Amino acid sequence: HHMNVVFVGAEMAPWSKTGGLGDVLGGLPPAMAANGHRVMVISPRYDQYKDAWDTSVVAEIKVADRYERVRFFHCYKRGVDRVFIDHPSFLEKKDNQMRFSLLCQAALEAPRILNLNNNPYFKGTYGEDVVFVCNDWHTGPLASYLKNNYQPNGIYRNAKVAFCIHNISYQGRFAFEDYPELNLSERFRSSFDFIDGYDTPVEGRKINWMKAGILEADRVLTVSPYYAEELISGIARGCELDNIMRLTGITGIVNGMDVSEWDPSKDKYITAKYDATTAIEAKALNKEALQAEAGLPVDRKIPLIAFIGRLEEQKGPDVMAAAIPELMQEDVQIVLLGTGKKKFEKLLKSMEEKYPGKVRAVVKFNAPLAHLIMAGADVLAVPSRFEPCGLIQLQGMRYGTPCACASTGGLVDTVIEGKTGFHMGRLSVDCKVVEPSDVKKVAATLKRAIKVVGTPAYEEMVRNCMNQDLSWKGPAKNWENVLLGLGV
Numbered sequence: 001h002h003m004n005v006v007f008v009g010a011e012m013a014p015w016s017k018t019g020g021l022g023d024v025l026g027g028l029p030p031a032m033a034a035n036g037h038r039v040m041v042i043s044p045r046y047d048q049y050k051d052a053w054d055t056s057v058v059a060e061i062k063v064a065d066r067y068e069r070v071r072f073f074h075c076y077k078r079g080v081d082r083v084f085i086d087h088p089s090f091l092e093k094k095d096n097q098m099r100f101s102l103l104c105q106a107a108l109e110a111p112r113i114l115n116l117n118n119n120p121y122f123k124g125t126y127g128e129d130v131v132f133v134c135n136d137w138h139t140g141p142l143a144s145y146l147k148n149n150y151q152p153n154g155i156y157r158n159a160k161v162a163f164c165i166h167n168i169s170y171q172g173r174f175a176f177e178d179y180p181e182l183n184l185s186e187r188f189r190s191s192f193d194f195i196d197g198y199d200t201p202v203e204g205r206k207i208n209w210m211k212a213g214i215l216e217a218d219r220v221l222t223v224s225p226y227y228a229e230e231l232i233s234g235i236a237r238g239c240e241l242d243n244i245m246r247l248t249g250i251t252g253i254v255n256g257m258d259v260s261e262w263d264p265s266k267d268k269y270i271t272a273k274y275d276a277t278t279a280i281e282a283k284a285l286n287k288e289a290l291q292a293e294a295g296l297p298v299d300r301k302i303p304l305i306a307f308i309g310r311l312e313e314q315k316g317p318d319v320m321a322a323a324i325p326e327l328m329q330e331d332v333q334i335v336l337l338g339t340g341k342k343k344f345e346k347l348l349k350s351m352e353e354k355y356p357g358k359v360r361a362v363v364k365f366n367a368p369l370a371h372l373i374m375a376g377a378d379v380l381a382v383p384s385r386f387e388p389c390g391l392i393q394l395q396g397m398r399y400g401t402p403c404a405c406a407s408t409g410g411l412v413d414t415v416i417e418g419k420t421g422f423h424m425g426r427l428s429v430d431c432k433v434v435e436p437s438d439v440k441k442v443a444a445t446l447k448r449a450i451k452v453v454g455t456p457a458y459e460e461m462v463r464n465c466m467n468q469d470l471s472w473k474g475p476a477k478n479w480e481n482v483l484l485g486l487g488v
């Protein structure tokens with residue numbers, strides 16, 4: 001009931017963030033700390049971070065051949081030991097395994113060779129009685145490395161490791177010839193062994209970090225009970241890949257959100273701050289502000305749909321694009337924000353091209369506009385092919401922007417038909433294709449939603465969306481309940 005928890009991962013918010021691998025490592029740790037636990041977060045140091053004080057300690061780490069020395073910078077925040085692995089690989093305007101071999105290894109060092117009494121309730125060295133939580137493929141090998149170099153000769157021993165699957169789309173798939181460069185022994189080789197892209201003319205033996213991660217760990221996890229069930233089942237399509245393997249007894253906990261960064265009542269990018277009680281009328285102002293900014297006609301009576309995502313197959317921009325002509329039979333505005341492929345970037349761009357005054361396709365990392373979008377949009381459209389957690393709909397609801405979404409993944413957990421949004425049905429999972437039945441559902445659902453807008457029930461829906469707790473408080477209790485199971 002009083003465990004030491006060490007979180008490892010490539011990205012770590014606020015410092016190194018892009019996808020919701022960042023947010024997870026930024027928010028879950030302190031929430032877990034606030035539950036009276038010794039909680040640490042090891043991740044690489046990508047830049048010369050300000051509150052990042054070198055604690056001088058250095059390990060030397062065996063990578064391929066070269067013996068590599070790492071610096072350990074520290075910053076101790078929010079009840080949480082934030083540790084940063086320093087090294088010149090971690091600064092690059094290939095040698096990809098190297099860096100994260102570094103990472104997993106260094107992360108095995110910081111628990112012992114660091115004395116850190118900053119915590120008012122816990123002193124000394126973290127110990128060798130740990131629970132490791134490994135995140136995404138980048139940390140796969142850690143479980144392995146621990147059994148290789150520690151458990152045989154008395155170090156850690158009764159410790160355990162949980163592997164968290166943030167997105168099955170990225171597995172860390174490498175040449176099988178590159179194996180030995182991990183200074184792990186053959187026993188573990190079999191766990192990495194992968195037959196990639198079978199039957200297709202590109203099939204090839206491969207090394208798979210996630211696979212290793214998954215197979216070697218004491219407990220496996222993902223970011224959503226429905227996603228867990230989608231995997232355990234068969235739907236395990238990471239798009240290009242499929243099933244990877246008969247996944248076994250995996251466990252899913254819905255993510256929380258960074259409720260401080262996204263807080264309509266304190267947000268500083270948007271024209272009008274609000275809570276649930278003034279949402280409707282402030283959202284109108286934000287909406288018009290948005291309408292201007294997007295050079296669309298300013299009119300609060302026009303329902304505005306929003307799409308915000310990386311323009312990749314997983315987030316269904318092609319599908320969104322196909323549905324536009326249909327929706328343009330209605331008096332509605334659609335604002336899309338994201339950046340990804342070319343084919344999609346121009347798919348949307350052509351849509352703006354065809355209906356100006358009604359469609360605006362924006363292509364950039366405009367964080368300010370995302371906020372503005374969240375504040376002013378009436379519905380968020382999230383036609384995902386697959387969706388492990390989803391941060392966009394959590395953000396949306398926080399801002400009272402109900403969601404019309406694909407009935408896949410974490411959206412099934414977080415978006416309730418009638419209370420906080422509108423399910424669309426599940427989309428064809430053949431990423432490379434655009435099912436006309438899908439184009440139909442998407443269109444259809446969006447039409448319903450926009451018809452709801454600006455009616456009493458809609459305002460209730462908004463209120464529901466705002467009145468949830470989407471902090472890490474509830475999540476963190478679920479996580480710990482799992483980290484309990486692990487005996488340590």
Ligand SMILES: Nc1ncnc2c1ncn2[C@@H]1O[C@H](COP(=O)(O)OP(=O)(O)O)[C@@H](O)[C@H]1O
Pocket residue numbers: 018019020021166167308309310337338339364365366367370388390391392395
């Ligand atoms: N153009 C953009 N500008 C600002 N933020 C963006 C943009 N595109 C995506 N995002 C943010 O990144 C996320 C998109 O999906 P993401 O969570 O990265 O999926 P995954 O974690 O599976 O990679 C959203 O949560 C959104 O807030």
